[PDB]
């Protein structure tokens, strides 16, 4: 997931906007 | 923005910074 | 063990408690 | 909610257990 | 996405945004 | 500056882009 | 609670969260 | 110690209540 | 180098200064 | 103590040296 | 003081603690 | 640099006073 991908790899501050509400 | 490698509360310190008032679902 | 927690301090304080289980922040509730 | 409990007011940890998936 | 940021919270909040690019804190400005 | 914008007042992230070398 | 892997100030950020007002002795 | 074990390994939020006062 | 430090911010600010040496927090003193 | 010095009041780092085992 | 190994915002959380009001230039 | 050396290796709280203003 993107809860992992960020740690394994990298991720944007858009990739993390999705999990918002 | 830059592609940043977050693990631990760092991740949540980011999630917070982005969404903040809306919320977020942290589920690993 | 009964503090004021507001902001990051809170959602950091969740991460330790629950962690892998998951948790959720939703100010508007 | 979480804030009222823990920010304006305060709470134990057993009161944070409560918001854990 | 429009919070109050004061202190570390701010200069931490810079690090994510800009990061490697670099950034600068200069209260006296 | 950064503070007035974001501390006394508030700001978006596009408003933090602004102080990045 | 969950078994969490803390190193660095993370450890102390935890110790704080728990005890807080009582105190704590950090000695590595 | 439990100042290390947490880093080497893992530890509870009870294991860390001991060092309190 | 003369700031207000309250809470975690403080006991984080100890960790850097002293660190391995050890330190202690004891609000009630 | 540490708080009065550094919270209500403020302090240098040489004033934090002071609480180090 | 002690020789401390900072990476990530930890580094900036230190830079902050030191200089604070003066400022600092973070450039990796 | 000292933006790296700290991460690669270690650094003092004097080494980091330089980059201040
Ligand atoms: Zn804070």
Tab-separated table of N, CA, C and O in Angstrom, chain E residues 1-6 10 13-14 17-18 21-25 27 29, chain F residues 1-3 6-13 15-21:
chain	number	residue	atom	x	y	z
E	1	UNK	N	-6.502	21.870	4.783
E	1	UNK	CA	-5.093	22.301	4.542
E	1	UNK	C	-4.970	23.827	4.691
E	1	UNK	O	-4.788	24.536	3.697
E	2	UNK	N	-5.079	24.311	5.941
E	2	UNK	CA	-4.830	25.727	6.341
E	2	UNK	C	-4.760	25.822	7.875
E	2	UNK	O	-5.734	26.221	8.528
E	3	UNK	N	-3.599	25.462	8.440
E	3	UNK	CA	-3.427	25.300	9.890
E	3	UNK	C	-2.574	26.438	10.446
E	3	UNK	O	-1.899	27.149	9.703
E	4	UNK	N	-2.615	26.573	11.769
E	4	UNK	CA	-1.651	27.360	12.490
E	4	UNK	C	-0.378	26.526	12.674
E	4	UNK	O	-0.451	25.385	13.127
E	5	UNK	N	0.777	27.099	12.308
E	5	UNK	CA	2.084	26.446	12.477
E	5	UNK	C	3.057	27.427	13.143
E	5	UNK	O	3.361	28.482	12.585
E	6	UNK	N	3.524	27.066	14.346
E	6	UNK	CA	4.440	27.893	15.148
E	6	UNK	C	5.502	27.009	15.821
E	6	UNK	O	5.185	26.129	16.627
E	10	UNK	N	6.304	24.268	12.393
E	10	UNK	CA	6.560	24.992	11.166
E	10	UNK	C	7.799	24.419	10.470
E	10	UNK	O	7.670	23.825	9.407
E	13	UNK	N	7.378	21.323	9.054
E	13	UNK	CA	6.418	21.435	7.951
E	13	UNK	C	7.073	22.003	6.688
E	13	UNK	O	6.518	21.859	5.608
E	14	UNK	N	8.218	22.673	6.830
E	14	UNK	CA	9.000	23.083	5.673
E	14	UNK	C	9.704	21.855	5.080
E	14	UNK	O	9.653	21.628	3.873
E	17	UNK	N	7.778	19.743	2.607
E	17	UNK	CA	7.368	20.500	1.417
E	17	UNK	C	8.548	20.597	0.443
E	17	UNK	O	8.469	20.124	-0.693
E	18	UNK	N	9.633	21.223	0.907
E	18	UNK	CA	10.765	21.561	0.064
E	18	UNK	C	11.805	20.433	0.136
E	18	UNK	O	12.131	19.829	-0.882
E	21	UNK	N	15.562	20.286	-1.883
E	21	UNK	CA	15.615	21.597	-2.535
E	21	UNK	C	16.340	22.587	-1.618
E	21	UNK	O	17.059	23.463	-2.084
E	22	UNK	N	16.124	22.421	-0.308
E	22	UNK	CA	16.557	23.340	0.711
E	22	UNK	C	15.409	24.253	1.089
E	22	UNK	O	14.403	24.305	0.386
E	23	UNK	N	15.565	24.964	2.208
E	23	UNK	CA	14.638	26.004	2.632
E	23	UNK	C	15.348	26.889	3.651
E	23	UNK	O	16.506	26.651	3.970
E	24	UNK	N	14.652	27.896	4.166
E	24	UNK	CA	15.266	28.751	5.143
E	24	UNK	C	14.211	29.352	6.080
E	24	UNK	O	13.121	29.742	5.665
E	25	UNK	N	14.581	29.386	7.364
E	25	UNK	CA	13.848	29.978	8.450
E	25	UNK	C	14.577	31.277	8.794
E	25	UNK	O	15.797	31.286	8.828
E	27	UNK	N	12.907	34.174	11.184
E	27	UNK	CA	11.881	34.913	11.913
E	27	UNK	C	11.966	36.431	11.735
E	27	UNK	O	10.942	37.091	11.585
E	29	UNK	N	12.299	38.980	9.647
E	29	UNK	CA	12.074	39.341	8.250
E	29	UNK	C	10.623	39.821	8.073
E	29	UNK	O	9.818	39.846	9.016
F	1	UNK	N	6.874	37.764	8.240
F	1	UNK	CA	7.116	36.887	7.053
F	1	UNK	C	6.414	35.547	7.186
F	1	UNK	O	5.183	35.501	7.267
F	2	UNK	N	7.209	34.466	7.217
F	2	UNK	CA	6.722	33.076	7.271
F	2	UNK	C	5.761	32.895	8.448
F	2	UNK	O	4.793	32.142	8.349
F	3	UNK	N	6.074	33.572	9.556
F	3	UNK	CA	5.338	33.492	10.812
F	3	UNK	C	3.994	34.221	10.660
F	3	UNK	O	2.923	33.648	10.891
F	6	UNK	N	2.019	32.339	8.472
F	6	UNK	CA	1.700	31.011	9.029
F	6	UNK	C	2.121	30.918	10.499
F	6	UNK	O	3.210	30.438	10.804
F	7	UNK	N	1.251	31.392	11.395
F	7	UNK	CA	1.427	31.258	12.843
F	7	UNK	C	0.399	32.153	13.542
F	7	UNK	O	-0.523	31.666	14.193
F	8	UNK	N	0.578	33.466	13.380
F	8	UNK	CA	-0.421	34.438	13.760
F	8	UNK	C	-1.633	34.238	12.850
F	8	UNK	O	-2.747	34.027	13.317
F	9	UNK	N	-1.367	34.301	11.542
F	9	UNK	CA	-2.304	33.925	10.499
F	9	UNK	C	-2.120	32.426	10.198
F	9	UNK	O	-1.556	31.684	11.022
F	10	UNK	N	-2.615	31.981	9.034
F	10	UNK	CA	-2.428	30.612	8.529
F	10	UNK	C	-2.096	30.698	7.035
F	10	UNK	O	-2.147	31.779	6.445
F	11	UNK	N	-1.760	29.551	6.435
F	11	UNK	CA	-1.382	29.498	5.028
F	11	UNK	C	-1.562	28.084	4.462
F	11	UNK	O	-1.558	27.102	5.201
F	12	UNK	N	-1.728	28.017	3.136
F	12	UNK	CA	-1.679	26.781	2.372
F	12	UNK	C	-0.226	26.316	2.283
F	12	UNK	O	0.670	26.947	2.841
F	13	UNK	N	-0.008	25.220	1.555
F	13	UNK	CA	1.324	24.700	1.317
F	13	UNK	C	1.971	25.457	0.147
F	13	UNK	O	3.169	25.743	0.180
F	15	UNK	N	1.869	28.299	-0.197
F	15	UNK	CA	2.390	29.462	0.486
F	15	UNK	C	3.664	29.112	1.260
F	15	UNK	O	4.248	30.005	1.862
F	16	UNK	N	4.084	27.837	1.244
F	16	UNK	CA	5.347	27.385	1.880
F	16	UNK	C	6.375	26.957	0.833
F	16	UNK	O	7.578	27.028	1.072
F	17	UNK	N	5.884	26.471	-0.304
F	17	UNK	CA	6.692	26.428	-1.471
F	17	UNK	C	7.593	27.662	-1.468
F	17	UNK	O	8.774	27.577	-1.763
F	18	UNK	N	7.008	28.802	-1.104
F	18	UNK	CA	7.609	30.080	-1.344
F	18	UNK	C	8.987	30.187	-0.673
F	18	UNK	O	9.844	30.862	-1.228
F	19	UNK	N	9.215	29.538	0.482
F	19	UNK	CA	10.533	29.641	1.192
F	19	UNK	C	11.318	28.334	1.040
F	19	UNK	O	11.600	27.650	2.013
F	20	UNK	N	11.679	28.018	-0.203
F	20	UNK	CA	12.369	26.789	-0.538
F	20	UNK	C	13.453	27.097	-1.579
F	20	UNK	O	13.125	27.553	-2.676
F	21	UNK	N	14.726	26.852	-1.220
F	21	UNK	CA	15.922	27.229	-2.020
F	21	UNK	C	16.036	26.349	-3.279
F	21	UNK	O	17.111	25.831	-3.604
